[PDB]
Design a protein around this motif. Structure first.
Motif, PDB file in Angstrom:
ATOM      1  N   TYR A 139      -7.130  -2.824  -0.535  1.00 19.72           N
ATOM      2  CA  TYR A 139      -7.825  -3.486   0.555  1.00 19.72           C
ATOM      3  C   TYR A 139      -8.404  -4.841   0.154  1.00 19.72           C
ATOM      4  O   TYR A 139      -8.871  -5.038  -0.987  1.00 19.72           O
ATOM      5  CB  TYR A 139      -8.945  -2.597   1.084  1.00 19.72           C
ATOM      6  CG  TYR A 139      -9.839  -2.033   0.010  1.00 19.72           C
ATOM      7  CD1 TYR A 139      -9.567  -0.810  -0.579  1.00 19.72           C
ATOM      8  CD2 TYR A 139     -10.967  -2.722  -0.411  1.00 19.72           C
ATOM      9  CE1 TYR A 139     -10.399  -0.289  -1.573  1.00 19.72           C
ATOM     10  CE2 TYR A 139     -11.809  -2.206  -1.394  1.00 19.72           C
ATOM     11  CZ  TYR A 139     -11.522  -0.995  -1.970  1.00 19.72           C
ATOM     12  OH  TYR A 139     -12.358  -0.517  -2.951  1.00 19.72           O
ATOM     13  N   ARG A 142       0.870  -1.160   0.000  1.00 19.15           N
ATOM     14  CA  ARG A 142       0.000   0.000   0.000  1.00 19.15           C
ATOM     15  C   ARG A 142       0.907   1.209   0.000  1.00 19.15           C
ATOM     16  O   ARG A 142       1.872   1.268   0.762  1.00 19.15           O
ATOM     17  CB  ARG A 142      -0.919   0.027   1.226  1.00 19.15           C
ATOM     18  CG  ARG A 142      -1.797   1.286   1.348  1.00 19.15           C
ATOM     19  CD  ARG A 142      -2.560   1.321   2.672  1.00 19.15           C
ATOM     20  NE  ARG A 142      -3.656   0.355   2.726  1.00 19.15           N
ATOM     21  CZ  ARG A 142      -3.549  -0.860   3.253  1.00 19.15           C
ATOM     22  NH1 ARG A 142      -2.388  -1.257   3.767  1.00 19.15           N
ATOM     23  NH2 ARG A 142      -4.597  -1.682   3.262  1.00 19.15           N
ATOM     24  N   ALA A 151      -4.550   3.454  -2.935  1.00 19.69           N
ATOM     25  CA  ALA A 151      -5.007   2.599  -1.841  1.00 19.69           C
ATOM     26  C   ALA A 151      -5.352   1.181  -2.287  1.00 19.69           C
ATOM     27  O   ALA A 151      -5.591   0.922  -3.477  1.00 19.69           O
ATOM     28  CB  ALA A 151      -6.155   3.226  -1.089  1.00 19.69           C
TER      29      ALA A 151
END
Lengths: 140, 59, 116, 150, 112, 101
Positions: free
Chosen positions: E75, E25, E73
RNA sequence: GGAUGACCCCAGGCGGUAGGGGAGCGUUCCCGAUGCCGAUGAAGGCCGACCCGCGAGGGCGGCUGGAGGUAAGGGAAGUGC
RNA sequence: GUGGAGCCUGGGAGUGAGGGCGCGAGCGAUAACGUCCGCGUCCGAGCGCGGGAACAACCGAGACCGCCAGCUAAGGCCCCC
RNA sequence: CGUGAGGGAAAGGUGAAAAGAACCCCGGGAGGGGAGUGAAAUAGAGCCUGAAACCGUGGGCUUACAAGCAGUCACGGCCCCGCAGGGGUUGUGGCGUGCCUAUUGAAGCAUGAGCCGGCGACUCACGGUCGUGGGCGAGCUUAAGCCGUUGAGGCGGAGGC
């Protein structure tokens, strides 16, 4: 009208000679000074009491038979680790504790009450290293 | 042994705080002096086949 | 006809859960947990409301007492003095005086040694 | 429809205690005090019925909403035929009408109107009166009505 | 501008991939590719495929420059678990949750 | 110059220019009341005993309001006693106009 | 006091389990309904520090939602976890 | 003596494991947080509030709500407080 | 599932229309980014609405001398909305023995509960007895039936009190 609450101020350094003073009859007062209940703008959550330098702690006077009869006491956390040290012997090695242990047990418990204890400076004096702060002499 | 067992569900907080040491550490790498590619030091660079500073390995 | 729970329960649950926002972990996540904190929050807010009235008075009296021992006498004397004087300025305001208007308080102290 | 077998032992399973799964406590289960076909009918004292018809018509008349008619001009079945007549009689459909007559043909004409509720006179009843703003009857119906309340 | 690529229903467990995603990240597409290369974890292979896909998208759809791409980003999300039976001692059946990850990577462009 | 005035069973130090919240007084909005005085401060320092005979403080009544809702709830353990009460305190907003003597 | 629930004044009562009583709230469904609201957005959902109610709740607003909804007054219950 | 006094008739109850304390006895050992009665109390239902370090029943006091106002009870007024 | 008698589930919804997403790009595929269809694509088939437990990401406040049924009161600092006010957070100080059940007595080291959602328990019939709103009153009432209606009611006095 909401009550006063002071903004922060300069803390007043104070000098006290023990010598001949009854331990704890003195300590009582040092405590008050520590909290700052002598200042009319006193606040409970704040720590605006004076910094208290006591000098000549070795010459604290005590009543009764407590020189050899009061016992200070520490527990480690081990079996039999209860340490019992008599007043006498306390004066004999770490005299500046005697008044230290007395003022503390007269301070509130909790974060703040430990903060205020730090503001207590005790020297089996005379002479304290706080010429820098120029402590105003106090009587009793 | 009498089959010991968790008394309480481990809270989310207490859980994750077990994992405060779980984070990975990135592969340490240096540029290989020949081909310039990134590789683990003390290996042979598999991109060009070179180590100190000769051909070792037909790639 | 049948009146299935339908919408009702969820709503009574959110009401409570919204009332519980802020609380630690499940107390703000679990309805039941929410209800149990709120009950406690309930009595505390009542109990401490009554208590707040006597928390400030003790503070005033501290604050006054200090200002009083500056002019050489104690809270208990001083207060006696006022009553004899016939001065009934509540100690909320006594306090304020002692810290905002030293002089007036100093006036009040004298009327108080006076009436004694 | 389920069996009645004890799903699992009364004791020592570590599960709760249950009999069959028809127990209303199961999602499979039966309902506890659920509807059974009943009969909501009861016998209202004839006098009360009698007085209501009476009082229902009374109220309406007390409002000059009651209107009796001798007959029905040129209505011979057709709905527009009835319209005509009702217009000529002060019945524009601004108000809603219980139209009571033993005349089959007049009822047929009035029937499909939204603002008309039709009725043979032996069918008169407080509800159909209270529903409607304006009561409109035959002499021939008006008679049987008075006969019902004698 | 952003380019994003997602891999959905990857048959790895989220808490395991997240460990790998967590490394890259905010790192430069260059750095990331490198890290993942010599990261000893099954998740790398997968995160790679997602990085790489998102890299193209950037360059290929959203008019962005390879030498400027970083991981803005990323996730991992949990997807539906594959519930599987694990037979155990004394007659008992256990239920294993073979888990499933939705891996997301979102590339941004490094201004300076 | 301030005074110490009494109203709604409580006392307050007021000054010209103050909006002050008090217990609801029976008094139309726009009207204007006189609060008894127990002490006057700054320059002229006069100690009402208990009130100062001549003095008053003139305030304008800006109007009346009901304070923010206080949830007063009682709970009793092991007894199924739970009460929920909503309480808004009524108040009167005052604009202190002047001090007398 | 007025003239019968309209409000005002004054005084007094108002801890509470079993439990008695009284007044309400909300859910489904019926009459009201060949109606009324509805794509200029129903139900339902997520917000709100706003309004009303002691309270259960009810509004109002924003987002979602995309086809239902259902008043005043009444009626009946698979009625509130 | 007008009190959430009383009496009469009917609807609905719950309760019929109490407990501690003071006092009067029996039992017990002029034992037990013992037991069994009597008068009273309080907890039960006031594990709400002050005191008692803590603490159902000891002292003080029967909590409709709000207040950053005042007098007090028991208990306290060296510091913790 | 059980040798068998027998037991016995779960599982409904794109859209108005498949217009079910050609073609391109990463990829072995799966998946995804563009393009396209659509009023709407967090309606994309793992498809209406999409609550909660639960898991992540990002942002604000906060936290490594601190003692706890987790809250509440007060003050203070920082963030936010605004321009005597609000919202978020919490440093310090005061205060504070979960909920239910069962009990003389429970924070209790006595019961129940992992959490969330949905299902879950004072009913109905016929009698009875008070009360009550009405109808009629030395009287009051019909039952089964019959006629009518097709959500219209009427007749029926046997009988009962």
């Amino acid at each position: 009208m909401k009550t006063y609450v002071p903004k922060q101020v300069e803390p007043r350094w104070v000098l006290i000679d023990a010598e001949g003073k009854t331990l704890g009859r003195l300590a009582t007062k040092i405590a008050t000074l520590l909290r700052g209940k002598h200042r009319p703008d006193w606040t409970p959550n704040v720590a605006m009491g004076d910094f208290v330098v006591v000098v000549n702690a070795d010459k604290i006077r005590v009543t009764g038979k407590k020189l050899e009869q009061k016992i200070y006491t520490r527990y480690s956390g081990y079996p039999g680790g209860l340490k019992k040290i008599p007043l006498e012997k306390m004066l004999a090695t770490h005299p500046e504790r005697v008044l230290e242990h007395a003022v503390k047990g007269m301070l509130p418990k909790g974060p703040l009450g430990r903060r205020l204890f730090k503001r207590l400076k005790v020297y089996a004096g005379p002479d304290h290293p706080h010429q820098a702060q120029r402590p105003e002499k106090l009587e009793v | 042994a009498k089959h010991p067992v968790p008394k309480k569900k481990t809270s989310k907080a207490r859980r994750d705080a077990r994992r405060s040491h779980h984070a990975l550490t990135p592969p340490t790498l240096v540029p290989c002096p020949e081909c310039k590619a990134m590789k683990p030091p003390h290996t042979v660079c598999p991109e060009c086949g070179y180590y100190a500073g000769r051909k070792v390995l037909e790639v | 006809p049948r009146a299935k729970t339908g919408v009702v329960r969820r709503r009574k649950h959110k009401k409570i859960l919204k009332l519980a926002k802020g609380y630690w972990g499940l107390r703000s996540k679990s309805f039941r947990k929410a209800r149990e904190t709120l009950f406690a929050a309930g009595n505390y807010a009542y109990a401490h409301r009554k208590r707040r009235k006597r928390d400030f008075r003790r503070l005033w009296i501290v604050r006054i007492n200090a200002a009083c021992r500056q002019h050489g006498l104690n809270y208990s004397t001083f207060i006696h003095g006022l009553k004899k004087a016939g001065i009934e300025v509540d100690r909320k305001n006594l306090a304020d005086l002692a810290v905002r208007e030293p002089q007036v308080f100093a006036e009040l102290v004298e009327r108080a040694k006076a009436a004694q | 429809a389920y069996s009645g077998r004890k799903i699992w032992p009364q004791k020592h399973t570590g599960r709760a205690r249950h009999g069959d799964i028809g127990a209303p406590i199961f999602v499979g289960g039966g309902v506890v005090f659920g509807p059974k076909p009943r009969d909501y009918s009861y016998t209202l004292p004839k006098k009360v019925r009698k007085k209501g018809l009476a009082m229902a018509v009374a109220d309406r008349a007390r409002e000059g909403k009651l209107l009796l008619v001798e007959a029905f001009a040129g209505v011979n079945g057709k709905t527009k035929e009835f319209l005509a007549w009702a217009k000529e009689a002060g019945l524009d459909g601004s108000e809603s009408v219980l139209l009571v007559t033993g005349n089959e043909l007049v009822r047929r004409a009035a029937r499909n109107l939204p603002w008309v509720v039709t009725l043979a006179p032996e069918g008169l009843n407080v509800y159909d009166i209270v529903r409607t703003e304006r009561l409109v009857m035959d002499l021939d119906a008006w008679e049987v009505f008075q006969n019902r309340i004698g | 501008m952003e380019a994003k690529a997602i891999a959905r229903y990857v048959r790895i467990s989220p808490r395991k991939v997240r460990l790998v995603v967590d490394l890259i990240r905010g790192k430069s597409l260059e750095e990331a590719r490198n890290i993942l290369r010599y990261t000893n974890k099954r998740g790398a292979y997968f995160v790679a495929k997602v990085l790489e896909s998102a890299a193209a998208n950037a360059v290929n759809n959203h008019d962005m420059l390879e030498d400027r791409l970083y991981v803005k980003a990323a996730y991992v999300d949990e997807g539906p678990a594959l519930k599987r039976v694990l037979p155990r001692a004394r007659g008992r059946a256990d239920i294993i949750k073979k888990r499933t990850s939705h891996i997301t990577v979102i590339l941004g462009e490094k201004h300076g | 110059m301030f005074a110490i005035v009494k109203t709604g069973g409580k006392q307050y130090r007021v000054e010209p220019g103050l909006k002050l919240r008090v217990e609801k007084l029976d008094a139309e909005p726009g009207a204007t009341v006189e609060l008894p005085v127990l002490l006057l401060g700054g320059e002229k320092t006069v100690v009402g005993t208990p009130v100062v005979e001549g003095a008053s403080v003139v305030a304008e009544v800006l109007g009346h309001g009901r304070g923010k809702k206080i949830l007063v709830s009682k709970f009793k353990a092991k007894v199924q006693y739970r009460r929920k009460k909503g309480h808004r305190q009524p108040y009167t907003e005052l604009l202190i106009k002047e001090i007398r003597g």
